[PDB]
C-alpha cells in the first residue's frame, strides 16, 4: 500500500521482505518489480558463498568448458 523509503514516498507498491535482483531502480537500495502486483524490496547483491579455506587444502579443477561470450561496442 504505502511504503516510506529514503528516496521518498512510494504509493501502490507492496513492500516485500524477500530479496531479489534489481528490476526497476528506486534508490537507496530499494528496487521495484512486477510479479500479480508491484512489489518493492531491498536489492540482493548475490548468492551467499563461503569457500572452505584451511591451511593445507587446495581445490583443483578436473575438467573444463569452453565458453564464448559477446561484447558489443
Amino acid at each position: 500500500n504505502v511504503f516510506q523509503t529514503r528516496a521518498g514516498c512510494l504509493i501502490g507498491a507492496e513492500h516485500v521482505n524477500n530479496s531479489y535482483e534489481c528490476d526497476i531502480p528506486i534508490g537507496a537500495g530499494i528496487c521495484a518489480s512486477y510479479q500479480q502486483s508491484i512489489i518493492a524490496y531491498t536489492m540482493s547483491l548475490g548468492a551467499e558463498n563461503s569457500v572452505a579455506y584451511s591451511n593445507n587444502s587446495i581445490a583443483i579443477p578436473t575438467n573444463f568448458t569452453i565458453s564464448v561470450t559477446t561484447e558489443i561496442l
Partner: protein, 312 residues
C-alpha cells in the same frame, strides 16, 4: 573517483518559481526545459552505472573463515570490523571520516554505502581465500602462503624464496599495512582527489543558485516584485529579460555538468579496469598497479570513490 552526486534541477520551477505568467512566457522558447531535464537524468543514471561497473564484478558474496590464520599475514586492517555498527574496515572508517529550495534535488545513490562495503568485503574474502581463481570461474580454495608463492613465481622469483623467508615477509606486509593507516590519518590532503569532485559540484550548484539574484537588465531580481508592481502588458518585458538570463545560466550549468560527468566516467572506467586486473588477477603492466613488481591489490570503498592498496 567513481561517481559524483546525482543532482536534478526543475527547469520550470528554477526559471519561473510558482508563477503561471512566467510559465506561459517560458513555453515560447520550445522544449529547452525538457532537454535540460533529460541531460541531468542521463547523468544521474550514468552515476549508478559507474558504481555498478566498479564494484559489482563478483556474483557470489564470499566470506572469510571465522578462524583467521593465513600463515602470519594479518588482514585485520582491511577486513570488516563487526564491533563497529557499520561493518567497515578501520581503513574504510578513516576514509569516510577524512572526506567532508529552488527546484534543486539530490537523488540518493542506488547502492547504499553498506552495499558497497559488502561488495568490497566479498572481493577481499575471495582474493584472500582463493587468489585469482574466483575471478575466472569457480572459487578454488588455496592456502594463502601457497598463493603468495604463486605470485612470487609470477614475477621471476622462485617460490622457495617466499617459504624460506615466510615469517619475514608476513612481518613486512603487516608493517606496511599499518603505515598506510597512519599516513592517511596524519595527512589531511591524502584524499584530495575525491574532495575535488565534491568541491566542484558544490561550487557549481552554489553559483547556479546565486544567479537567481541577478537583474539581467530587469527592474528587479524578484519575479513577485515585478508581478506586484506592474500589469502584464509591460511586466512581460521584465519577465522576458529574467527568463533569458536564468535560462542561459541553467544551460551553462548543464553543459559544465556534462563535461565533468564525462571526466568522472573516464575515471570510473579506469577504476573498473584496475579492479579487474590489479585485484582479480596479477598484472605484468608496469606502473599500472603501483611502483615495483605487482603482487596483489586490496580494494577499499571510499565516499564517491575507490582506494586500492597495491602490494608490490
Amino acid at each position: 573517483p567513481v561517481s559524483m552526486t546525482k543532482t536534478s534541477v526543475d527547469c520550470t520551477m528554477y526559471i519561473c518559481g510558482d508563477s503561471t505568467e512566467c510559465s506561459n512566457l517560458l513555453l515560447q522558447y520550445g522544449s529547452f526545459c525538457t532537454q535540460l531535464n533529460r541531460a541531468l537524468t542521463g547523468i544521474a543514471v550514468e552515476q549508478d552505472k559507474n558504481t555498478q561497473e566498479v564494484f559489482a564484478q563478483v556474483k557470489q558474496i564470499y566470506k572469510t573463515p571465522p578462524i583467521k590464520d593465513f600463515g602470519g599475514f594479518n588482514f585485520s586492517q582491511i577486513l570488516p570490523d563487526p564491533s563497529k555498527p557499520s561493518k567497515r574496515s578501520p581503513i574504510e572508517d578513516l576514509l569516510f571520516n577524512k572526506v567532508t529550495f529552488n527546484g534543486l534535488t539530490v537523488l540518493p545513490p542506488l547502492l547504499t554505502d553498506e552495499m558497497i562495503a559488502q561488495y568490497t568485503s566479498a572481493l577481499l574474502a575471495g582474493t584472500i581465500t582463493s587468489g585469482w581463481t574466483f575471478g575466472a570461474g569457480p572459487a578454488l580454495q588455496i592456502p594463502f602462503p601457497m598463493q603468495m608463492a604463486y605470485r612470487f613465481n609470477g614475477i621471476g622469483v622462485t617460490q622457495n624464496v617466499l617459504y624460506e623467508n615466510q615469517k619475514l615477509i608476513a612481518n613486512q606486509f603487516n608493517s606496511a599495512i599499518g603505515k598506510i593507516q597512519d599516513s592517511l590519518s596524519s595527512t589531511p590532503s591524502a584524499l584530495g582527489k575525491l574532495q575535488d569532485v565534491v568541491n566542484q559540484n558544490a561550487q557549481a550548484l552554489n553559483t547556479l543558485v546565486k544567479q537567481l539574484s541577478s537583474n539581467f537588465g530587469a527592474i528587479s531580481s524578484v519575479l513577485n516584485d515585478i508581478l506586484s508592481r506592474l500589469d502584464p502588458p509591460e511586466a512581460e518585458v521584465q519577465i522576458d529579460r529574467l527568463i533569458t538570463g536564468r535560462l542561459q545560466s541553467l544551460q551553462t550549468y548543464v553543459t559544465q555538468q556534462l563535461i565533468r560527468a564525462a571526466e568522472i566516467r573516464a575515471s570510473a572506467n579506469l577504476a573498473a579496469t584496475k579492479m579487474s586486473e590489479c585485484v582479480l588477477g596479477q598484472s605484468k603492466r608496469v606502473d599500472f598497479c603501483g611502483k615495483g613488481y605487482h603482487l596483489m591489490s586490496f580494494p577499499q570503498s571510499a565516499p564517491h570513490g575507490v582506494v586500492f592498496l597495491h602490494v608490490t
